[PDB]
Design a protein around this ligand. Structure first.
Ligand code: SF4
Ligand code: SF4
Ligand code: SF4
Lengths: 56, 260, 176, 70, 114, 318, 156, 144
């Protein structure tokens, strides 16, 4: 956060905890908004043999 | 009926929001009736989807894939955080404590985009469907859920700092609405309304569904049956949800998200 | 497997009793909550400067509907009517005739946004990616009649948001 | 951030500082550049009335010193 | 007379604000708008019906407590006397009697409501 | 020139109330991770003007069941008394110098209560009647403790003259001498102005809008202005009584500034309390004020009567 | 003329005050009320624009119908609207309040609040996002900005 | 101390917007005076800025044009004035501005984005798009 050391110390004392560690606002730890393309797997019935529907 | 401000008789008149959901469901297919459950409890949406999905799957005699069940529980507990935030903050808001409402609703906003990033809707995701879920988790969603749940514990502790030990909050809740264990069962109470009176009963423990028998969590139990004890149960349930969420974020299995 | 909230007796040591009396008389927990909210005072507010700043959204966002066209420029809608059949709110009204070329083209494609539940079932049922809930969510109108979209409204919407709709499809179609 | 509240606090500070200053300046203006004399007791009021007559102009603020005698 | 001037100015300013409030805006009144507010539904009974006080005893005793506060007000001037022993004894006597009345009301469950 | 002084004590107070509305909104927002009014004017400085213009251009409604005379008299009494309770305040020089300004303040507050009473009664609504009865119960609970604490803290002043408070605190704040009385007086002032943890007369979350539920446009604006003016005036009273300020007779501005800053700090603490605690139940309010303060106020009254005699420190009469 | 200029400037002053200090009443019926709470949430902060949620209808300027308007609720909604002192505005939020939404063909749902009260802004969605509702309210502020109430009076 | 740094940042914000006049202009139009890297400007005149030092939700913002499609938008800035290609980047649907990754060019895609035209003469009026179903019988024009 863009908070000065005096303000950070006052905030931590008033709260009683280290707020600068577990900040609620998200800055950079979020995942990227442009993720690589995926490749999802097929299910257990995507086989060319021994897969008659009467058995499942 | 008030004698001064003492409540002689309390008569709830309901039906002002009766939209005939049960009748409208009869005219629509099982898939078309799924969005109706999102609107039943519009504070806990995906939990309603799961209950309807389980009922249909039980009749269908099918089984959702292992990965879908974990997604149903991961978002089942994120849904629980959404409701308990609404349940506690608005309860405190009506008492007079307005500040914790805004603190937690920012976290409630962060969980809303978890709904939106996985379904495309902030509240009514219609994501949990009979047979699993609709789509697989987008890449990078699990990491962002971890980042949220990492710091969400402090938010609950900040909430407790303002309410748990406040003598004004205790005066408004301690020994208010005391429900005996026997009366709660007879009157049909369930959930926190039972465990707030000491009754040890949780449907995730006694009658587990999906993968709730593979996660570890503690059931908070009240001791006096008043509003304050049920307040502590809901606050502790939020903490226990984070315990479940962490397990779901580490035990997520590979596989498909729909019954094949 | 279960936990006891409350159910904690207090120690009756003279030091502990004195500490409790000091808490009662000097309002220690009240000052504690005051310090908590004072700390919240000096935090950075989470407000975003709307409409100059817009909240985060995802490619799967379900917003204003739009009828897409093939790269060739022709409508993808081939009037299969299953988007109308799956719509749980019965918001879609479709009428079709054999066009002058003989193709399956709708003559009426009407969706009342005032009845739609923004479920997406329509875009998920369409076999040619014609009807697609686009990314637009700020299309509020001053009159009820403007929300009863025609085929012309949807086609126009699709042509306006195509660039973005396409990009979102390309980003998300692997999950579908 | 939090310093954005300061403009309103400063405007309210000016609005609350006006009354006091205005009263002090009006008291000095209407009492010959001196604090407005208090008359909590009848003795002080009698002193004020005598001073008014001594002044000769029916105003108590103007005070006549040793120059007036003889 | 200055206090009278201040009171007159304040009252006139307030009444002028009332006048401007009731004559500047565009008024459109009808029966439904001016009906009593009961959270959207029509009230059952009249608002001028009896409203039981569960703290009536507290008020009747607050009468006598206000009396005692009136008796205690001259104390700052009473300390300027030469008979400080008698003055102090009488002041403590009045305070002790006030405390005793409060204690009697408290123990006999008078401060409790209903 | 006296009329100019009256105007210079009324108009700035109304402007201070108007901007205190904005200050409260922004403080609550920034303590709730929000931003107060920030669009209307720079940093929201034009919000109070917009609110006032909206309210006074809004149609006022006269309830059909309401007694018109009282319904109109109540708002006037509320504002007139709220503006009058500033007349005797020493900043550093009081507009009207009374030998018993303190009792004048007490009487003026006691009368202001009838504004809420009559507004509630005349509104002829169940919620308004409940609000009026809650105001009655509130004034039953705090008045005795308020007067006793004020008497006890003025026992070191020598008189009820407000100006003398500056002299008594020439070397030390009187809060260092009566801080338990200071705490109880602060809570009593919170209860009196129908303010934080004691907002029972209005009860937004329990009585919709309390006594002023049937008030709209101008009269509602007058009640709000009266409420906030009473807030600032009571905080000013708390400042002069306990947080004394240096007064150089040749530079009164020094006191004025110190005084204003202390009053602003106390108002900010009022808002701070408003956004930090839940609301009392007025049964619990009366029980607190009658069973935890009142015994302690009586004990401290005994103590502050006996102390100057036992320490030979009786303050001068004049 | 000088007369029109003064009236036009006065009309702008009146419009600016009303549109920048809109006070919606705390009136939420269904799912859409939850998203309405998120507009008052810190992220969007409706109070930042001067939009403050008053409780009593007599101290409100806008009624945001957020949720399904059932038949049992319709008389209550109308009376609460009628008790709002003019100028009052109605903003319909969600498809349930627009034309009945998911429950359009229901025996106990009014097909839109338009059949009960006149609506100024229709906010589409089920539920509309907190920005969509904020967009509608900001659109209402623009609509009030285009109100020539005094300017027409000078030309009546 | 760092208060000097904070005041220096304030003066740098004053200078960055092009003097005090620009600082006031951005203050009374967007209620925000912080500066950011200029990602790009669309043809309609909107300017898009970015500052990754801000928390997620304020790291991207747009300053709307003062004139769009023949409408004075100096004060009446609208949320629908963002063209679709910048709508992804502004709403954080992607991390790629359209300047870097251009949208795919189609002939049917509008060459002029239009804001919400509700309440204007260009608003959308619904109507039936099908032809008349039953054709009436035209009586003969010749007498008998
Ligand atoms: S939009 Fe798609 S699903 Fe609907 S009728 Fe056309 S082709 Fe079929
Ligand atoms: S989003 Fe759902 S309700 Fe709306 S048109 Fe599509 S299928 Fe029908
Ligand atoms: S429009 Fe949708 S979300 Fe809103 S109240 Fe109706 S059903 Fe619920």
């Amino acid at each position: 956060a863009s908070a000065t050391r005096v303000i950070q110390l006052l905030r931590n004392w008033a709260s009683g905890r280290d707020l600068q560690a577990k900040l609620q606002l998200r800055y950079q730890e979020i995942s990227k908004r442009t993720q690589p393309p995926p490749k999802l797997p097929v299910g257990p019935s995507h086989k060319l043999s021994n897969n008659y529907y009467c058995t499942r | 009926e008030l004698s001064g401000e003492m409540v002689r008789k309390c008569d709830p008149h309901i039906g002002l929001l009766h939209r005939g959901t049960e009748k409208l469901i009869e005219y629509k297919t099982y898939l078309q009736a799924l969005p109706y459950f999102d609107r039943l409890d519009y504070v806990s949406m995906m939990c309603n989807e799961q209950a309807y999905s389980l009922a249909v799957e039980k009749l269908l005699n099918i089984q959702p894939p292992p990965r879908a069940q974990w997604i149903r529980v991961l978002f089942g507990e994120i849904t629980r955080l959404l409701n308990h935030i609404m349940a506690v903050t608005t309860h405190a808001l009506d008492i007079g404590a307005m500040t914790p409402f805004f603190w937690m609703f920012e976290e409630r906003e962060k969980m809303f985009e978890f709904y939106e990033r996985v379904s495309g809707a902030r509240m009514h995701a219609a994501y949990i469907r009979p047979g699993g879920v609709h789509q697989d988790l987008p890449l990078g969603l699990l990491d962002d859920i971890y980042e949220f749940s990492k710091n969400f514990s402090f938010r609950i502790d900040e909430l407790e700092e303002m309410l748990t030990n406040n003598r004004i909050w205790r005066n408004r809740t301690v020994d208010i609405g005391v429900v005996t264990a026997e009366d709660a069962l007879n009157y049909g109470f369930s959930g926190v309304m039972l465990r707030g009176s000491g009754i040890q009963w949780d449907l995730r423990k006694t009658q587990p569904y999906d993968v709730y028998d593979q996660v570890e969590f503690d059931v908070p139990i009240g001791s006096r049956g008043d509003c304050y004890d049920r307040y502590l149960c809901r606050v502790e349930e939020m903490r226990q949800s984070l315990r479940i969420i962490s397990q779901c974020l580490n035990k997520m299995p590979p596989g498909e998200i729909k019954v094949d | 497997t279960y936990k006891f909230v409350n159910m904690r007796e207090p120690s009756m040591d003279m030091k502990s009793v004195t500490d409790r009396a000091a808490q009662t008389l000097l309002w220690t927990e009240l000052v504690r909550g005051l310090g908590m909210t004072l700390s919240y005072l000096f935090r950075e507010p989470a407000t975003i400067n709307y409409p100059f700043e817009k909240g985060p959204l995802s490619p799967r966002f379900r917003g204003e509907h739009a009828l897409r066209r093939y790269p060739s420029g022709e409508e993808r809608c081939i009037a299969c009517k299953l988007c109308e059949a799956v719509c749980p709110a019965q918001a879609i009204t479709i009428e079709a005739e054999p066009r002058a070329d003989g193709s399956r083209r709708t003559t009426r494609y009407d969706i009342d946004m005032t009845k739609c539940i923004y479920c997406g079932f329509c875009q998920e049922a369409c076999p040619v990616d014609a009807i697609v809930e686009g990314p637009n969510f700020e299309f509020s109108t001053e009159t009820h009649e403007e929300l009863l979209y025609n085929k012309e409204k949807l086609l126009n919407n699709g042509d306006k948001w195509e660039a973005e709709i396409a990009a979102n499809i390309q980003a998300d179609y692997l999950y579908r | 951030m939090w310093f954005e509240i300061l403009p309103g606090i400063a405007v309210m500070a000016a609005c609350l500082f006006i009354p006091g200053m205005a009263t002090a300046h009006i008291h000095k203006f209407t009492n010959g550049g001196k604090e407005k004399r208090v008359a909590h007791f009848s003795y002080q009021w009698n002193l004020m009335e005598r001073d008014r007559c001594i002044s000769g102009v029916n105003r108590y603020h103007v005070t006549k010193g040793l120059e007036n005698i003889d | 007379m200055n206090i009278m001037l201040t009171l007159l100015t304040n009252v006139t300013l307030a009444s002028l604000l009332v006048l401007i409030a009731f004559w500047l805006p565009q008024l459109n009144a009808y029966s439904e708008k001016t009906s009593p507010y009961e959270c959207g539904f029509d009230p059952m009974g009249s608002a001028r019906l009896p409203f039981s006080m569960k703290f009536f005893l507290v008020a009747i005793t607050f009468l006598l407590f206000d009396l005692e506060i009136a008796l205690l007000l001259p104390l700052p001037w009473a300390s300027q006397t030469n008979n400080l022993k008698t003055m102090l004894t009488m002041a403590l006597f009045l305070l002790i009697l006030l405390a005793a009345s409060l204690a009697y009301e408290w123990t006999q469950k008078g401060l409790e409501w209903a | 020139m006296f009329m100019i002084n009256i105007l210079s004590l009324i108009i700035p107070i109304l402007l201070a109330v108007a901007f205190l509305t904005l200050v409260e909104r922004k403080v609550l927002g920034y303590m709730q991770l929000r931003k107060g009014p920030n669009v209307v004017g720079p940093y929201g400085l034009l919000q109070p003007i917009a609110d006032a213009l909206k309210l006074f251009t809004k149609e006022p409604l006269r309830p059909a069941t309401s007694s018109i005379s009282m319904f109109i008299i109540a708002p006037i009494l509320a504002l007139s008394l709220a503006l009058t309770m500033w007349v005797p305040l020493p900043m550093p020089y009081p507009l009207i110098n009374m030998n018993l300004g303190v009792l004048f303040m007490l009487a003026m507050s006691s009368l202001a209560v009838y504004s809420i009473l009559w507004s509630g009664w005349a509104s002829n609504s169940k919620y308004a009647l409940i609000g009026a009865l809650r105001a009655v119960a509130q004034t039953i609970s705090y008045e005795v403790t308020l007067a006793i604490i004020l008497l006890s803290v003025l026992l070191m002043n020598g008189s009820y003259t407000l100006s003398t408070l500056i002299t008594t605190q020439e070397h030390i704040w009187m809060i260092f001498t009566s801080w338990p009385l200071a705490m109880m007086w602060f809570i009593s002032t919170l209860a009196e102005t129908n303010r934080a943890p004691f907002d029972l007369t209005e009860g937004e979350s329990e009585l919709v809008s309390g006594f002023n539920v049937e008030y709209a446009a101008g009269p509602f604006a007058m009640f709000f202005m009266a409420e906030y003016a009473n807030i600032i005036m009571m905080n000013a009273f708390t400042a002069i009584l306990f947080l004394g300020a240096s007064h150089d007779p040749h530079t009164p501005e020094l006191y004025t500034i110190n005084f204003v800053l202390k009053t602003l700090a106390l108002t900010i603490t009022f808002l701070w309390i408003r956004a930090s605690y839940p609301r009392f139940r007025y049964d619990q309010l009366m029980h607190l004020l009658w069973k935890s303060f009142l015994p302690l106020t009586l004990a401290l009254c005994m103590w502050h009567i006996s102390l100057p005699i036992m320490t030979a420190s009786i303050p001068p009469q004049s | 003329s000088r007369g029109e200029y003064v009236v036009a400037k006065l009309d702008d002053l009146v419009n600016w005050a009303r549109r920048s200090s809109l006070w919606p009443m705390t009136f939420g019926l269904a799912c859409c009320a939850v998203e309405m709470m998120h507009m008052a949430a810190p992220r969007y902060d409706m109070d930042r624009f001067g939009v403050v949620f008053r409780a009593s209808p007599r101290q409100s300027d806008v009624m945001i119908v957020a949720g399904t308007l059932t038949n049992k609720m319709a008389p209550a909604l109308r009376k609460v609207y009628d008790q709002m002192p003019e100028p009052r505005y109605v903003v319909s939020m969600g498809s349930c309040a627009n034309g009945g939404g998911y429950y359009h063909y229901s025996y106990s749902v009014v097909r839109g609040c338009d059949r009960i009260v006149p609506v100024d802004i229709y906010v589409p969605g089920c539920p509309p996002t907190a920005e969509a509702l904020l967009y509608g309210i900001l659109q209402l502020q623009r609509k009030i900005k285009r109100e020539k109430r005094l300017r027409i009076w000078y030309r009546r | 101390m760092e208060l000097v740094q904070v005041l220096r940042r304030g003066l740098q914000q004053v200078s960055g917007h092009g003097g005090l006049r620009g600082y006031l202009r951005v203050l009374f139009r967007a209620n925000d005076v912080r500066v950011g890297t200029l990602v790009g400007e669309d043809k309609y005149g909107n300017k898009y800025y970015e500052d990754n030092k801000q928390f997620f939700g304020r790291h991207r913002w747009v300053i709307y044009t003062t004139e769009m499609n023949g409408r004075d938008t100096f004060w009446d800035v609208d949320g629908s004035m963002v063209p679709p290609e910048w709508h992804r980047w502004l709403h954080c649907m992607t991390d790629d501005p359209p300047t870097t990754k251009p949208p795919t060019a189609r002939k049917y895609i509008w060459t002029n984005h239009k804001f919400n035209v509700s309440g204007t003469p260009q608003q959308y009026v619904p109507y039936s798009t099908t032809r008349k179903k039953i054709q009436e019988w035209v009586p003969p024009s010749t007498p008998y």
